[PDB]
Amino acid sequence: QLTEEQIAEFKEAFSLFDKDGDGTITTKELGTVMRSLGQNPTEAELQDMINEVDADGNGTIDFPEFLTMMARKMKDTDSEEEIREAFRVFDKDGNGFISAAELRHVMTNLGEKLTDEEVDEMIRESDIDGDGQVNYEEFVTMMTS
């Protein structure tokens, strides 16, 4: 299970699913956010995953149920691969660096509203080595803050 801090981060991430907020989500929001980040689950796959925690039967899910749904037995090697995979969601061209334009793609896919100037500020605050781009180390450091 999760640390108090991990839970806190996922709760903020959950608001991106639960946009009306509200506090609950359905299969509808699951797929949209999933597609928004380059995944393409079918409706039967969503329905079947929902089934574990929709206990219930009403087709809606709250935050603790969402955490349970993300949970599974993992290898020693698994959590690092997932974080690397998250970085690749941002680094769309696979050159090892997240550019301003790549962040904007992700931000805007998720419905975030900010100016190009504010996209540049985000890059600047994460950009520790100062080359104007976010590499893996800096990405992780930010995620861990």
């Binding site: 981060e9 903020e12 991430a13 608001s15 969601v89 605050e125 995620m143």
Partner: protein, 724 residues
């Protein structure tokens, strides 16, 4: 200083200013009436919303939630034809006294389906949907308690509930129709024109819709309480007997008219915007629709007509012929029964007691007949709607008021318990961290020592007397906190009542002085055996089956009420408080003091007192973001209501004592929402500076939100693989 609300004898509250403070009372100058002053107790002067023009759908959105600000919010909304307003989960409904457009359409019904409370404007439809949803999700029967004075709007809102549920979640056929036609049929026999309501329900009802395990409608069941027996024979100057009597006289065909020997109502001792002809038509429609054939319909009509002619016998020959004929009796058997050696008064009361008993048993038959039209072998859950009158002003309080106020004590207790439970669950879920009226209930209903049992004892005495009964009450409960003697009253006319002629009970809603003349006789529903035997040997099968010397009215009702509470206690409960705006049945006329008094009597002010104990101000992130984004820098206005509010909390450094950042809402201690509003309305540049110093944290929060969201999507992806 700032304007405040202070008492007003006809408006309830009025705007004024505090011009002086005392230790017990404040000195108030009414707005613009310089030189005019009056005194008010400190606890009766309330802060006012700065914006006197705004209205809110949920009173928990007010910066100051008290009886005055609530009165005002409801007033504004009502003047804009918004009759419905929330106090958290409680619905307040003000009677408009006219047909407001759009809000009851089938298409409006559709817009409410599946929506959470607060996502749509306040409506009876929303209370109905939450009840279906909760029944289905929680697998728990549900109740909707619709309360208020005569003419407040209980019956109408009950009918809106049943319309909503059948249209939204009904079968599509033929049982849905019977659910909505059941009450209008009962209203024929149980409703009457009174001085308070042209269509007053002279009985209480609990109407259940039953569902199967799949939450599909399988049936219905109606319970009925306390039919007003006295109205059958005599009615007040500006009042009528039950509708059926006038509908039959007005609308029956010449054929039925000849068979039943009917004329205009002025030909009967027992007997406008009232369309009796039209209503008869509608009644016949309902009867056919629910499966009554013409034989039964006529069996009902004959008994009604039989009661009418019975009332025409004064101490006639022709009325005796008609009555005995229709009720299937030998004239001579009837004449003897009403005269066996009796005085004129005793003869009238024999005729009246028979008429009452026959009619009441007809009403029982009609209620049962209606339940026979949507029967069920089994069900899993029900949604029940309670429609009964509560406490209301009468200049004379007799046994009828005693029974109704006793009912109100038990139902008010349920409401108190339930509202407390709802609030506890909120504070626990969100991490926020009473005076029973059982003694008054016990005074009335306790075995052996309660008033109902003492009354029954009197009825059983060889020479029952109202005065003996009243004295027995006073001796038994001399020192009870809830019982008092009339001569102790501050009102002169109460002090005119002798100790053995009344008592005062300190009910939830306030002291009630009961005059106890006729308590003994009113507590007895029995019919003398000479009369009951007569009607039991009717040549008519139907009249015999109605019936196929003391019966306690109070203890009969106590049994019924206890069964009702067993049911209610097994349900999740929702509450609609109906409010009569004036005593004139007129629209756009808000009588502040009359409405304020209803809000006090029905326990709403008490509900507000509870909420002032914790976090009475409650606002969703979306509501706050919409209200306050204009005060903040553009960068902040570009979030995301949740992160917007998070950033505010961080930039202002709101403490954990006064402010609670909830799961979906901000919860404020009393006065703190006003303080927050004040902070937002200063000083644009300083506010900007507070945001600036929080900037790095905000950028990091934005980063992590999206970073941790993509990690979530990866785990969701990986999960789907784990399951395959």
């Amino acid at each position: 200083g700032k304007p405040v609300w202070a008492p007003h004898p006809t408006d309830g509250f009025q705007v004024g200013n505090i011009v002086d403070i005392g230790p017990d009372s404040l000195t108030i100058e009414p707005l613009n009436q310089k030189g005019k002053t009056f005194l008010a107790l400190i606890n009766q002067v309330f802060p006012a919303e700065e914006d006197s023009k705004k209205d809110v759908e949920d009173n928990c959105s007010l910066m100051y939630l008290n009886e005055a600000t609530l009165l005002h919010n409801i007033k504004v909304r009502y003047s804009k034809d918004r009759i419905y307003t929330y106090v958290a989960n409680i619905l307040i409904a003000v009677n408009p006294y006219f047909d407001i457009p759009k809000i009851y359409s089938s298409e409006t019904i559709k817009s409410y389906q599946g929506k959470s409370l607060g996502t749509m404007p306040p409506h009876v439809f929303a209370i109905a949907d939450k009840a279906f949803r909760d029944m289905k999700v929680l697998k728990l029967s549900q109740s909707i308690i619709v309360s208020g004075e005569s003419g407040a709007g209980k019956t109408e809102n009950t009918k809106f509930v049943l319309r909503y549920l059948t249209e939204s979640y009904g079968t599509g056929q033929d049982i849905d129709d019977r659910i909505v036609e059941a009450n209008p049929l009962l209203e024929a026999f149980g409703n009457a024109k009174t001085v308070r309501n042209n269509n007053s329900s002279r009985f209480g009802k609990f109407v259940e819709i039953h569902f199967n395990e799949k939450s599909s409608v399988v049936g219905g069941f109606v319970s009925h309480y306390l039919l007003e027996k006295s109205r059958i024979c005599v009615q007040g100057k500006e009042e009528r007997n039950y509708h059926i009597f006038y509908r039959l006289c007005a609308g029956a065909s010449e054929d039925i008219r000849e068979r039943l020997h009917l004329s205009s109502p002025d030909n009967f001792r027992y007997l406008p915007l009232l369309d009796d002809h039209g209503d008869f038509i509608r009644m016949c429609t309902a009867m056919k629709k629910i499966g009554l054939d013409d034989e039964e319909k006529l069996d009902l009509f004959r008994v009604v007509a039989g009661v009418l002619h019975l009332g025409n016998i004064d101490f006639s020959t022709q009325a005796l012929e008609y009555c005995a004929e229709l009720l299937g009796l030998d004239q001579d058997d009837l004449r003897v029964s009403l005269t066996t050696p009796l005085k004129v008064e005793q003869a009238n009361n024999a005729r009246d007691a028979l008429a009452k008993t026959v009619y009441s048993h007809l009403f029982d038959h009609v209620v049962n007949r209606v339940n026979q039209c949507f029967p069920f072998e089994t069900s899993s859950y029900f949604i029940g709607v309670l429609d009964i009158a509560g406490f209301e002003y009468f200049e004379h309080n007799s046994f009828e008021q005693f029974c109704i106020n006793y009912c109100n004590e038990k139902l008010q207790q349920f409401f108190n318990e339930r509202i407390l439970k709802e609030e506890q669950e909120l504070y626990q879920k969100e991490g926020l961290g009473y005076v029973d009226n059982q003694d008054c209930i016990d005074l009335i209903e306790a075995r052996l020592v309660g008033i109902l049992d003492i009354l029954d004892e009197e009825n059983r005495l060889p020479q029952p007397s109202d005065q003996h009964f009243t004295s027995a009450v006073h001796q038994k409960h001399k020192d009870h906190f809830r019982l008092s003697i009339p001569r102790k009253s501050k009102l002169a006319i109460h002090r005119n009542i002798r100790d053995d002629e009344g008592f005062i009970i300190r009910h939830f809603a306030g002291a009630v002085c009961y005059e106890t003349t006729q308590f003994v006789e009113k507590n007895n529903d029995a019919l003398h055996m000479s009369l009951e035997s007569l009607i039991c040997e009717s040549r008519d099968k139907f009249i015999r089956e109605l019936f196929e010397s003391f019966i306690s009215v109070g203890n009969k009702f106590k049994t019924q009420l206890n069964l009702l509470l067993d049911k209610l206690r097994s349900t999740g409960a929702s509450f609609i408080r109906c409010i009569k705006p004036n005593l004139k049945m007129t629209s756009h006329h808000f009588e502040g003091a009359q409405i304020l008094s209803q809000l006090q009597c029905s326990g709403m002010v008490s509900v507000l007192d509870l909420m002032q104990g914790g976090f009475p101000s409650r606002a969703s992130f979306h509501e706050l973001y919409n209200m306050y984004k204009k005060y903040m820098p553009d960068k902040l206005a570009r979030l995301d209501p949740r992160l917007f509010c998070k950033a505010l909390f961080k930039a202002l450094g709101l403490n954990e004592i006064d402010y609670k950042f909830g799961l979906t809402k901000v919860f404020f201690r009393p006065g703190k929402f006003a303080e927050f509003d004040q902070i937002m309305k200063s000083d644009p540049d300083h506010l900007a500076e507070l945001v600036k110093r929080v900037n790095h944290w905000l950028i990091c929060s934005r980063w992590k939100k999206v970073q941790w969201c993509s990690l979530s999507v990866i785990k969701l992806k990986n999960k789907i693989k784990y399951r395959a």
